Amino acid sequence: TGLDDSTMQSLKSSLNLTSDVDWSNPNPCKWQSVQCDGSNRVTKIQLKQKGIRGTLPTNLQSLSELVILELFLNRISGPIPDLSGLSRLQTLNLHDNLFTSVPKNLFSGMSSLQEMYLENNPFDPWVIPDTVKEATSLQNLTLSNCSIIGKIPDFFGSQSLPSLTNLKLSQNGLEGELPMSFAGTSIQSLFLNGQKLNGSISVLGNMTSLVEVSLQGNQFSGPIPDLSGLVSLRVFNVRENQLTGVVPQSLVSLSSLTTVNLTNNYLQGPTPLFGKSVGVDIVNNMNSFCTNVAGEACDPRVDTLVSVAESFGYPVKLAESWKGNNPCVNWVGITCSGGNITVVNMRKQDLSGTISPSLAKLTSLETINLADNKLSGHIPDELTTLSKLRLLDVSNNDFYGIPPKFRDTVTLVTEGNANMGKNGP
Ligand SMILES: *[C@@H]1O[C@H](CO)[C@@H](O[C@@H]2O[C@H](CO)[C@@H](O)[C@H](O)[C@H]2NC(C)=O)[C@H](O)[C@H]1NC(C)=O
Ligand SMILES: *[C@@H]1O[C@H](CO)[C@@H](O[C@@H]2O[C@H](CO)[C@@H](O)[C@H](O)[C@H]2NC(C)=O)[C@H](O)[C@H]1NC(C)=O
Ligand SMILES: *[C@@H]1O[C@H](CO)[C@@H](O)[C@H](O)[C@H]1NC(C)=O
Ligand SMILES: *[C@@H]1O[C@H](CO)[C@@H](O)[C@H](O)[C@H]1NC(C)=O
Numbered sequence: 001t002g003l004d005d006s007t008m009q010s011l012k013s014s015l016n017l018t019s020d021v022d023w024s025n026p027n028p029c030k031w032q033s034v035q036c037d038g039s040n041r042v043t044k045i046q047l048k049q050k051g052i053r054g055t056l057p058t059n060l061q062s063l064s065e066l067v068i069l070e071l072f073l074n075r076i077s078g079p080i081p082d083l084s085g086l087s088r089l090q091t092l093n094l095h096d097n098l099f100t101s102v103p104k105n106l107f108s109g110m111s112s113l114q115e116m117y118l119e120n121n122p123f124d125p126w127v128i129p130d131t132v133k134e135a136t137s138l139q140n141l142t143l144s145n146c147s148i149i150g151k152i153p154d155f156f157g158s159q160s161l162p163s164l165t166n167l168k169l170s171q172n173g174l175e176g177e178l179p180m181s182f183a184g185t186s187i188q189s190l191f192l193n194g195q196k197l198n199g200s201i202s203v204l205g206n207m208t209s210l211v212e213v214s215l216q217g218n219q220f221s222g223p224i225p226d227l228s229g230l231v232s233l234r235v236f237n238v239r240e241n242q243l244t245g246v247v248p249q250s251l252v253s254l255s256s257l258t259t260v261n262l263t264n265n266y267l268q269g270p271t272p273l274f275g276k277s278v279g280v281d282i283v284n285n286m287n288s289f290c291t292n293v294a295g296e297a298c299d300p301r302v303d304t305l306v307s308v309a310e311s312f313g314y315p316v317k318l319a320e321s322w323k324g325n326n327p328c329v330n331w332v333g334i335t336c337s338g339g340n341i342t343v344v345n346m347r348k349q350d351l352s353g354t355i356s357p358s359l360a361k362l363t364s365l366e367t368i369n370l371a372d373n374k375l376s377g378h379i380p381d382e383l384t385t386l387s388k389l390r391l392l393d394v395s396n397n398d399f400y401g402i403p404p405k406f407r408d409t410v411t412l413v414t415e416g417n418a419n420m421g422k423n424g425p
Contacts, residue, residue, distance in 0.1 A: 001040060002027070002040040003041060004028065008031070008063075011060065013057070014055045014056060015047075015055075015076070016053045017052060018052055021033065021050065041063075045066070045070070050073075051074055053075045053077065055079075058082070063086070068089075069094075074096075076097040077099065078100060079099065079102075079103070080099050080101065082103045087110065089113055091116075092113060092115070092116045094118050098122060099118075099122070099123060101123060104126075106129055110134060110135050111134065113137055114137050114163075115138075115140035116140070116141055116142070119143060119168070120144070121146060125148070126147065126148060127153075128148060138163060142166070143172070145171045145172070149172070150175070154179040156185060164187055165186070167191070169191065170191045172195055173195055174196065177199035177200070183203050183206035187207060188232075189210075189213075190215075195217070201220050201243070202222070203225075207230070211232050211233060212235040213238075214237040216237050217241075219241065221244065221316055223314050224238070227248065235258060236257065237259070238262060242265065244318075246270075257274065259279045261281035262281065263281050266288045268287075268314070268322065269290065270290055270291070271294045271295070273294045288319045288322060291325050308356045309322070310356065315349075328341070342365060344362070348371070350374065355394075356380075359383065360385055363387070365389055367390060368392045371395040375399065377399065377400075378400065378401040379394065391410070391411045395416045396415075398418070403421065
């Protein structure tokens with residue numbers, strides 16, 4: 001009476017059905033919580049929260065017309081079998097079982113899949129396979145707490161997964177950087193909290209459909225990008241990272257914003273002042289803001305030095321040290337003669353970037369040593385206005401252009417800059 005009958009017997013044998021599930025009929029299309037279409041092919045199997053033990057039969061993918069498979073909150077163990085024959089499957093919900101592995105070709109063949117929830121299964125550790133690019137209808141993917149390792153694959157772009165909306169990969173063991181193909185996507189919910197992701201979060205600024213993002217508890221560094229395109233952003237949680245730099249005004253000014261968690265980073269400049277409808281999680285002293293008063297301006301020397309750090313790319317080493325509103329109190333590389341900043345010394349600090357023209361606003365400076373780094377660009381002419389400057393040593397970088405003329409009394413060391421004096425087109 002049906003092409004799926006024999007595979008359904010395999011399923012009935014491999015599951016220890018609880019007792020209020022009646023699968024006794026000779027016709028599996030009449031089984032409880034099983035649905036068939038007009039041609040007697042199985043289209044839905046929905047055994048929700050029954051605590052059922054057993055396994056999945058390895059011929060499950062023979063149910064080629066299966067559309068809905070919901071078995072979450074049971075105690076089903078063993079491997080998840082090959083699912084590539086389930087080309088009409090729209091929903092796969094297996095969360096909170098006892099499955100111990102996923103097929104290595106997961107997503108292959110699954111051209112109708114809209115949503116997949118596997119979270120909280122004790123899987124053997126696995127990398128998200130590149131066959132995820134075959135699940136071109138995917139909208140919801142929750143693989144949180146699934147023992148995933150490796151990197152986020154670069155297959156979440158729009159010409160692969162144009163419908164992807166809710167990507168939840170919380171509490172795995174992912175590492176590495178955010179994929180570039182996140183740029184231009186229409187992901188609306190991104191949960192990557194609680195693992196080992198690192199690098200820059202600038203790609204967020206090209207994710208203009210984002211409504212909710214949590215990067216909480218990773219190793220992201222660098223500044224928060226320009227977010228002025230994220231006109232629907234409501235929840236922004238980047239708690240417990242290594243973010244540095246000034247909180248951009250484009251984030252503080254988003255009218256859609258509802259909730260912001262910045263606690264436990266190395267953010268610099270003034271504590272930001274969000275709108276008063278915003279729930280704000282910024283606990284005193286758990287960043288590197290100049291004061292703990294939201295909206296309070298910094299000391300102008302602090303503003304100047306943060307601009308200097310900006311052109312170094314906001315290194316974590318400076319942000320961890322440059323705390324409070326007085327640069328004369330134990331800031332690394334900063335020496336003062338009673339209130340006046342007199343020395344900026346960052347020799348051999350692996351610095352990349354340029355020298356900010358703002359450095360010339362520290363008008364009491366007597367020595368600048370930036371030797372033995374990886375800086376480039378021009379030496380700013382504004383430095384020649386430093387009337388008390390006696391030594392500018394930029395040895396062993398990659399500066400170019402015309403070296404400015406300092407007064408007779410300034411010692412300028414530019415040796416080791418191969419392209420110094422080169423100023424052609
Ligand atoms: C994809 O995930 C979203 C959750 O972000 C689902 O939308 C929610 O569904 C629940 C049902 O459990 C409703 O109570 C919520 O009101 C929905 N929230 C919305 C619509 O913003 C959605 O159903 C999932 N599936 C698909 C196919 O999109
Ligand atoms: C992110 O910050 C928000 C805002 O401070 C936190 O939301 C608060 O959570 C507790 C729970 O009762 C209460 O202080 C308030 O009810 C919430 N305020 C709101 C919703 O505006 C939220 O807990 C933080 N998230 C994390 C993961 O730490
Ligand atoms: C994560 O999954 C494991 C099973 O591997 C489970 O014991 C644990 O409760 C899950 N954690 C959460 C927060 O659900
Ligand atoms: C980020 O993590 C990867 C993988 O562990 C590592 O190879 C890379 O050097 C890290 N990058 C940064 C900037 O920390």
